[PDB]
Amino acid sequence: ATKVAVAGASGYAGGEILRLLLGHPAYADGRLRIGALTAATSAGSTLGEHHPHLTPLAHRVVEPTEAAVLGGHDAVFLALPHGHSAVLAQQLSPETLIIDCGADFRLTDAAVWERFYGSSHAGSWPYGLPELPGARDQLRGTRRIAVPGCYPTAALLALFPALAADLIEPAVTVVAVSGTSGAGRAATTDLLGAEVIGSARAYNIAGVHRHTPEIAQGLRAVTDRDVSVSFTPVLIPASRGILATCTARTRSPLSQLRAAYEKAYHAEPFIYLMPEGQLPRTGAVIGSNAAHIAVAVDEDAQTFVAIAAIDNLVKGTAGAAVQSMNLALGWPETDGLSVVGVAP
Amino acid sequence: ATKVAVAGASGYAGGEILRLLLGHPAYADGRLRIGALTAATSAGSTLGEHHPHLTPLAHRVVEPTEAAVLGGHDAVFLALPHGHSAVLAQQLSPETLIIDCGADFRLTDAAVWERFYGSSHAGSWPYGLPELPGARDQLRGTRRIAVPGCYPTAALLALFPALAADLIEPAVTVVAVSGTSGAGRAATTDLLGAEVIGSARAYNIAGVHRHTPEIAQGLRAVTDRDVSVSFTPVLIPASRGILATCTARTRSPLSQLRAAYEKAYHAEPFIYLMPEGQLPRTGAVIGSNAAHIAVAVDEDAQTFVAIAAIDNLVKGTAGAAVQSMNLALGWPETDGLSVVGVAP
Amino acid sequence: ATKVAVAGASGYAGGEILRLLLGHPAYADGRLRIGALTAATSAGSTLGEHHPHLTPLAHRVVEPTEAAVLGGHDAVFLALPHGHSAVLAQQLSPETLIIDCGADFRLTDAAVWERFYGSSHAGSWPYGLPELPGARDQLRGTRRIAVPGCYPTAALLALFPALAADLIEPAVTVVAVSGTSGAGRAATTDLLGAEVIGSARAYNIAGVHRHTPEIAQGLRAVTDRDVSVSFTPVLIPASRGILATCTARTRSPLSQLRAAYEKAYHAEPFIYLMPEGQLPRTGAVIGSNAAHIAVAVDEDAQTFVAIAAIDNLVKGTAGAAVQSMNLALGWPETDGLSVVGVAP
Amino acid sequence: ATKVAVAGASGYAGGEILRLLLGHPAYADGRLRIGALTAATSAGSTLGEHHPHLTPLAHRVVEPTEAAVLGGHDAVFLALPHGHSAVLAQQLSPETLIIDCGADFRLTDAAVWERFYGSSHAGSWPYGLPELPGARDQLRGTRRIAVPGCYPTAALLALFPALAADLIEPAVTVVAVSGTSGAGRAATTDLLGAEVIGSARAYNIAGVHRHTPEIAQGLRAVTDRDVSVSFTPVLIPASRGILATCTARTRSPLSQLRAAYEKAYHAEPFIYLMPEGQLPRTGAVIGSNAAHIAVAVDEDAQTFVAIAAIDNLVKGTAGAAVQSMNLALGWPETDGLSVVGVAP
Ligand SMILES: COc1ccc2oc(C(=O)O)nc2c1
């Protein structure tokens, strides 16, 4: 009865929305209808030209991207770059579920948006990260979703408990490796297979990366102290995956950092704490909506280290969208989002 | 009802079988229960120490592979080296469904089997290739199953429908590239990551790879003529996937061959014919039970060319295992096996 | 005192030429200066913005590709392995040593050329593959070089000693895996890292690959029969590397065939026969101008199998180019060319 | 004429010394000669069996690792599987140049050594990082040399100059990604291509890594305050390369920090300072002995960021090893070591 359209369907995100939408129970029983699949430039093509893993929808024809095609859908995924979701949302009937993978609606501070993105703040919508305290309540039956960035999802999951229990200091370093699908499907020379194979490199360093404020915005959402974030992302030879290594100055004990995480997550179905003597690997969460997380303390340096492993495309993008979609239409949150990753 | 056991749950196959069983719809509604996860290798530990993606079963403990342990199971998965499924099939009730991922019960010729293994021939169970014509009816209600080798699964899918209608000569050549995951978890020096990264090498050439006669066996089943197969495997920097390039001297028009395949596979839900001038790619099938297949004709060389992409671990082993038992138990055969790959 | 210019310096073939020139003995003593570096687009930027691995040259500003800029150089390299260089070559003084990496001057049949390239045939220079019979002689002193394609160099190297001795039939099959760098540096979607990592796809199949007639061409110079080439190329997750699997039916015994290959190759310094029971791998030759070669007989298939492994940018391109530059300036053939690869 | 021996030649470390030795200019003129090749578990096999990339020495036989096999050599490179070569070192003539790629003779603090390794402190020989203040002198004419770890080489090359001019706090964080050739050649189930490919994982975190102290020790040698090291190593899908992300609270403008680096390094030919707007990548330095460094300041977070790239098997092992052995014998430091990488 609920028909959904996808803007950006030819992208990596839109291909991952459509993969999950195809595995959904409400798509098996026909509750959910895959409607119009639109793209910016390849309007006229079949889906199987872009996404040959989506063979069920291979025949589909990709449509232009305007409200003339997105009307009369109940949900609408925008897997768009920024600046487009803002104008496009305003064009759709305010009763339709807009779920935005773009950044346009993530930020609460307008002057912060302006410094990192260079367009005008559209405004804030419910953040698509159910585990974040106070977010699940906000998304229940909501008709707007701003899905998080991939890196902030890894960083908040790794760091927020220990800072929410005031067991670490509100200055955190984050260094996260990520696979090449976070860069997008836009072809450049830095994303050529020959350039990324057999090479790592960090980029947009020393605070300029746009996720930096997102990490701090979500860290400020469980603390009263000023929050400082040094963010460094590294590109590695992998197609999916994000290993976030999170550090902060601490003084509290391990048994208290530990016990605070399993209280935060012992009921969270998608967040998994590694058994003692295990560390997360991106490999283990790939294709799933899970996050493998380990905590430890560096004593000779008085530092808390949290490590976190998500899939940039699932829990960092599309999974988060469908998860928070489920809460938006009252369906079971884990409707269609497995915790078993495809390995090796 | 229907209790399930897995012998050799330590290795790549066991985990993959467990991964499928966890998504099987009979596991949701209870008609299937995951029981003894047995293993000679490291009996005593938790699964998670070996399969950190199967976290619903990370707590389970690896009992050793014993007749006593598999006893009292309505179904026993056997993903171990050759020779031990001959031993253990003899130690279990002839009514228990035995699905063997090993080699023992595949070759219905006896001098051939001793020829390339040095064993002595255990016997012959129905070939778990529900798309080999006739094989579907020999598994509808069976209790003994031998699932195929990964490369044969791909060659015979690429080659049979054209040899079946004798549009090709029975002298076939097949060079197939595969990931490191079909070589097993037995840590050897040449399977190391540093060596297999950035490297492709041929191995077990000049028809001495024990998948050579298994391709033969499948192929005589569709020709009265004299088959001779030149098989070369090549290993490439990937973990899952098989791309099989299969060519043969031909003289029939492309149209005659094209339509033969559309006939053999139009109502095959797992076998997908690439649209005209599209080509299989392993990344599109990985994590899926799909075979992606394309054919053309080399006129100047008067060769038929067939390309077949399977996920080596799903459709080439575990997914076929699961597929056969679906037919064994009179459950729909598409249950718990998807055609949507995980890509990129 | 030889001045050298490279047209196409911002790409892979050009960059690898420069890399071999910087470690050349003639460059170390002033006998070879590195003149102009040109490319179509991106003039005025620095070479380090394209090849940060070539830090000795990183300061060099890239100039426009005109026959002017290229003038006043004793040797000019045309780094266009996928481009068309015939125009320029006939606008430069004919006293210049011209090394064309592209295909324009490879083929000695205008008809074959128009069919596979859709353009007017521009002629036929000495094939820069010194190892093939009577190839090294036409090169000694030559001021015009046609550099062979990566795939062609491999297949030819593994099959010709045996066609030449009439110890195999002239109907050869060649299936070659290659890293993504042979696809050049043009930013196309299907060459992004996300796409090529974890996948393998055959491309341009059924003899529609412009390298098919080149292998036929080079093979025909060693026999009298026509030669029928079934050539299949596959892309694998690697940046460099070519491992060609070459089959052909025979009734020769192996010891005769190995005899052929030792005779063809005992005094060839860039060509290494694998000891009995060893097979080449691509990682073993990356960086080196070497080729690694094995040969076997599938007897139950009456087939002869050869494996060749070379680097697609060294022996398949810049190494051959430089190896034929040494023969063209009367310098030692191995000057600048290592036989030791950079593994792992 | 210096006869050189290599203990543990069949490992990644050893293979990389012999490769560098073959390109050394004193191995062409004959002042250097490759003597014994000791191999613990494979005496009696052919080196080619272990290092198919080293074909000039494929024929050599691997001998048992014994002091008589080595004696009678002017130089002995020690590269044991887990170092711990103090025992064997003691069995050698004091006349001999001993270059230890292990850890036993690295650390100058015997209690530190005991705590991290759990063993006798055997002492400390000159550290093979000629670029460190006052270390190059300790190296001219030495006959003992302790090769530094791959990780400390990069962390100390990214951090020493800031600390040396007192421009950062002495509390430093290091997150370093690395290829699997830094973890040795010992066949283990988590070092398999199927496990590494597709995955990143941090290991031995939060002070547990035996290179945390090494980084701490080299940093102390340049400032008068005391230093803490948060060190986190991350394994990524690559055979070679380390990308070190280094941070510390900042005391200064960036102009002060860049000056500190251009002064410290401008006369170091293996250290390359990235230009305006560029950042280092591991793929630029592969197989060269260069390190590429860039530095920046994150003003919002009051954090300095250094990024360093080196080939772990070259500048973190065999290159430092041969670069030291050049100074041990008064040869030019740069002999046999290029600053040009094998990209892509
Ligand atoms: C992570 O959030 C996004 C948002 C837009 C995107 O677009 C693409 C693309 O590949 O075209 N990937 C995307 C990811």
Numbering used by the authors:
A (entry chain C), B (entry chain D), C (entry chain A), D (entry chain B): 9 to 352
Which sentences did the original study use to describe this structure?
The L-arginine biosynthesis pathway consists of eight enzymes that catalyse the conversion of L-glutamate to L-arginine, appears to be attractive target for anti-Tuberculosis (TB) drug discovery. In this work, the ligandability of four enzymes of the pathway ArgB, ArgC, ArgD and ArgF is explored using a fragment-based approach.
Additionally, structures were solved with 4 fragment binders, occupying either of the two distinct pockets: the substrate-binding ([Fig fig2] and [Fig fig2]) and the NADP(H)-binding pockets ([Fig fig2] and [Fig fig2]). 2 mM NMR401 inhibited ArgC activity by 10% whereas 2 mM NMR863 caused a 12% inhibition. Our results further show that in the case of ArgC there are two possible strategies to develop inhibitors, with one targeting the cofactor binding site and the other the substrate binding site.
